[PDB]
Amino acid sequence: ETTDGVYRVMTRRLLGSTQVGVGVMQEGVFHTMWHVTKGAALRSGEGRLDPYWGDVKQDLVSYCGPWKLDAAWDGLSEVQLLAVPPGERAKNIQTLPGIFKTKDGDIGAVALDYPAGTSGSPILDKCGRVIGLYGNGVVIKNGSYVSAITQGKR
């Protein structure tokens, strides 16, 4: 129920299901963006995953334990978005990150546009480590999107 991998985050009512996000299972902890779940409990197979930690400002939340993803973008190399869009197979998209320049340091950022329910898709370095999650970003003048490479503290 906690096997490592990338997962879709779904909701079901009285009809079909909707994909609201994506997350990463690593070391028995599920990692996703706060705006995907709002810290609601997650059903996994027969079991239940409970929120352990989160921070609305980082837009992150973990389940079952503390945040485990500590890999950092090197500021130099290309990365891969492992995009898991609603209703589509997981696909790797390679890109050279731009940068969000903030008063509190620079954050790598990827100029890739996907549906809202792709939120929480992991961003990878060349060794396959997750250097952050996709889906909290900005819209620029031409209407395209730039996502921060959002990474938590371990």
């Binding site: 079901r12 492992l82 903030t102």
Partner: protein, 40 residues
């Protein structure tokens, strides 16, 4: 509201992948609610 997860794949790097997108350098601010904004 049944919120649940389902596996979508293994987390691996894809050899010979599509390289795309630009690399913008943007001045941004982050508020306490987790929203980025562009600096004018």
């Amino acid at each position: 509201v049944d919120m649940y997860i389902e596996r979508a794949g293994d987390i691996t790097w894809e050899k010979d992948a599509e390289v795309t997108g630009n690399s913008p350098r943007l001045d941004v601010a982050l508020d306490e609610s987790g929203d980025f904004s562009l600096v004018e």
